[PDB]
Design a protein around this ligand. Structure first.
Ligand SMILES: Nc1noc2ccc(-n3nc(C(F)(F)F)c4c3C(=O)N(c3ccc(-c5ccccc5CN5CC[C@@H](O)C5)cc3)CC4)cc12
Lengths: 52, 234
């Protein structure tokens, strides 16, 4: 199932390497330690509506 | 935009507006980074000398967060033709960097394969702009956004009087009165995935607006991701 099942639990980009899920993130984000979540490096990361 | 709603504070921070020497908006754009705007190639003919305004929601008032940026380099896809409206895409390098803030921030560029199978297979995307609120109306003074369904590609080509190329996709409604319109051209079509908004399209053209049996035609960003990447190093 992998990427096809709920985006492989990735926050953003998902692809399959050797039959396993690999997550990655847009520029301005860093992959979290769990290898799934994407963490913004600045105050205005791309794709976020501005609130603060 | 016909129908839909006003972008509320901070809601559409990646929207840019191409303004002519009379300081009026004629087309939209999407903020890609501090130096780069994405818009449509056909917009480059809609004025002789233009600049890019960001952070604006209401063109009748100076809200305070607005900034105008001169265009340093125009990068127009050399395959674009008014005959076909294929390859309707351009990137603009700005002379000065955009400072991100309330109502000013980039949309994400997705990866191709992921975007194709995950973003464009969602129900809908979001288009925004200052364009006409009716096919015969004037430009909007307020920034608007509209949720628009992705349209099946077969249905898309049947509905069209013009050849829908592989660089184009349809979005909108069969009959409901919601659509993009003249003046929205060049602007953002974005798709949401877990509260993060990725650029998926460029408002391109349409047989009038909100018309029965007709959809909005958008430039398929995923087919130009490599090209965009290269333009952003130019
Ligand atoms: N529904 C939408 N989504 O995004 C849009 C962005 C702009 C507009 N638009 N508004 C109006 C107005 F009726 F208000 F004038 C017009 C348009 C618009 O593009 N025309 C249009 C129609 C067909 C083509 C086209 C499509 C494919 C290939 C070539 C062409 C150009 N040719 C030159 C001769 C012309 O007949 C055909 C280009 C523009 C209509 C006006 C609608 C939409």
């Amino acid at each position: 199932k992998l990427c096809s099942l709920d985006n492989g639990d990735c926050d953003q980009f998902c692809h399959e390497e050797q039959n396993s899920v690999v997550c990655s993130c847009a520029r301005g984000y860093t992959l979290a330690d769990n290898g799934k979540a994407c963490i913004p490096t600045g105050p205005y990361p791309c794709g976020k509506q501005t609130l603060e | 935009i016909v129908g839909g709603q006003e972008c509320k504070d901070g809601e559409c921070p990646w929207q840019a507006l191409l303004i002519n020497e009379e300081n009026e908006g004629f087309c939209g754009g999407t903020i890609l980074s501090e130096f780069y705007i994405l818009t449509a190639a056909h917009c480059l003919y809609q004025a002789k000398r233009f600049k890019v305004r960001v952070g604006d929601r209401n063109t009748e008032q100076e809200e305070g967060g607005e900034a105008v940026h001169e265009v340093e380099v125009v990068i127009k896809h050399n395959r674009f033709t008014k005959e076909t409206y294929d390859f309707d895409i351009a990137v603009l390098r700005l002379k000065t960097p955009i400072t991100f803030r309330m109502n000013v921030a980039p949309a994400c560029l997705p990866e191709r394969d992921w975007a194709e199978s995950t973003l464009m297979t969602q129900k809908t995307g979001i288009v925004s702009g200052f364009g006409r609120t009716h096919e015969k109306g004037r430009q909007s003074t307020r920034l608007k956004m509209l949720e628009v369904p992705y349209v099946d590609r077969n249905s898309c080509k049947l509905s069209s009087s013009f050849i829908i190329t592989q660089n184009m996709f349809c979005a909108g409604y069969d009959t409901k009165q919601e659509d993009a319109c003249q003046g929205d051209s060049g602007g953002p079509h974005v798709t949401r995935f877990k509260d993060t908004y990725f650029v998926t399209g460029i408002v391109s053209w349409g047989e009038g607006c909100a018309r029965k049996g007709k959809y909005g035609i958008y430039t398929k960003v995923t087919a130009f991701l490599k090209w965009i990447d290269r333009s952003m190093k130019t």
